Amino acid sequence: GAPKPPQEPDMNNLPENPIPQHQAKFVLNTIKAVKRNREAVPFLHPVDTVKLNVPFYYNYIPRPMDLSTIERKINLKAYEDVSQVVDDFNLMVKNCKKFNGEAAGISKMATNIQAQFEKLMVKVPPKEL
Ligand SMILES: O=C1c2ccccc2Sc2cc(-c3noc(-c4cnccn4)n3)ccc2N1C1CC1
Ligand SMILES: O=C1c2ccccc2Sc2cc(-c3noc(-c4cnccn4)n3)ccc2N1C1CC1
Ligand code: NI
Ligand code: NI
């Protein structure tokens, strides 16, 4: 099957102007809140295709994503905008639905934590200032 993509973030391609700290603190706390959701447990760590016996996972999913990667990218200043945090969360969810199917129980878990994430993000402070 397709090989495992490199871990994010690319430490040689970090942005010159990352998310401002007041937004970075908020999205970090937002991800940590989602990580405490019981529905988030299977999303805490990258898919391990050996443990799960899916040799063709990366053929479906060329850009895997998980909550720990989002947290790491926030901490390592890899994001330029909070829209990219939203994008990565949506990518994690879309990956799950693409590989497992929309009707799978794991995809309902993904939808549930996406709904929590979206509700929490209502209160993100604006970028300017
Ligand atoms: O995409 C998948 C995926 C990919 C291939 C096959 C199934 C799944 S579903 C899935 C399950 C897990 C998992 N972690 O632990 C256990 C477990 C299961 N029973 C007993 C003990 N532990 N399952 C982690 C990630 C995960 N995800 C990612 C969308 C989350
Ligand atoms: O038989 C199966 C089985 C049944 C159906 C589909 C796949 C598998 S393979 C399999 C994986 C898991 C699992 N535990 O943690 C994770 C994980 C994966 N990535 C990230 C984080 N965590 N996967 C547990 C039990 C397990 N087993 C039992 C033989 C062990
Ligand atoms: Ni292979
Ligand atoms: Ni704004």
Residue numbers in the entry: 192 to 320
What do the paper's sentences say?
BET proteins are chromatin-associated factors that regulate transcription and chromatin remodelling. BET proteins bind chromatin through their two BDs (BD1 and BD2), which specifically recognize histones acetylated on lysine residues. The BDs from C. albicans Bdf1 (CaBdf1) share 31–46% sequence identity with human BET BDs and 58–66% identity with those from ScBdf1 and hence are likely to bind multi-acetylated H3 and H4 tails. In conclusion, Bdf1 BDs are required for the viability and virulence of C. albicans and can be selectively targeted by small-molecule inhibitors without compromising human BET BD function.
In particular, several compounds possessing a dibenzothiazepinone scaffold exhibited low-micromolar IC50 values towards CaBdf1 BD1 and no or only weak inhibition of Brd4 BD1 at the highest concentration (20 μM) tested. One such inhibitor was compound 1. ITC measurements showed that 1 binds CaBdf1 BD1 with a Kd of 5 μM, consistent with the IC50 value (4.3 μM) determined by HTRF, whereas no or only modest binding and inhibition were detected for Brd4 BD1 and CaBdf1 BD2. Furthermore, a BROMOscan screen from DiscoverX revealed that compound 1 showed no significant activity against 32 representative human (BET and non-BET) BDs; indeed, an ITC experiment confirmed that the two human BDs (SMARCA2 and SMARCA4) with the strongest BROMOscan response did not detectably bind compound 1. To understand the molecular basis of selectivity we solved the crystal structure of CaBdf1 BD1 bound to 1. Compound 1 mimics the acetyllysine ligand by interacting with the conserved Tyr248 and Asn291 residues, forming direct and water-mediated hydrogen bonds via the thiazepinone carbonyl group. The dibenzothiazepinone ring system engages hydrophobic residues from the Val-Pro-Phe (VPF) shelf (Pro233), helix B (Phe290) and the ZZ′ loop (Val238, Leu243 and Val245), while the cyclopropyl group interacts with the VPF shelf (Pro233 and Phe234), helix B (Cys287) and the gatekeeper residue on helix C (Ile297). In contrast, the oxadiazole and pyrazine groups point away from the pocket, adopting different orientations in the four complexes present in the crystal's asymmetric unit. Superimposing the ligand-bound structure with that of Brd4 BD1 results in a steric overlap between the larger Brd4 side chains at signature positions 1 and 3 (Trp81 and Leu94) and the oxadiazole and distal benzene groups of compound 1, explaining why 1 fails to inhibit the human BD. Steric hindrance from the corresponding residues in CaBdf1 BD2 (Phe409 and Ile422) also account for this domain's insensitivity to compound 1.
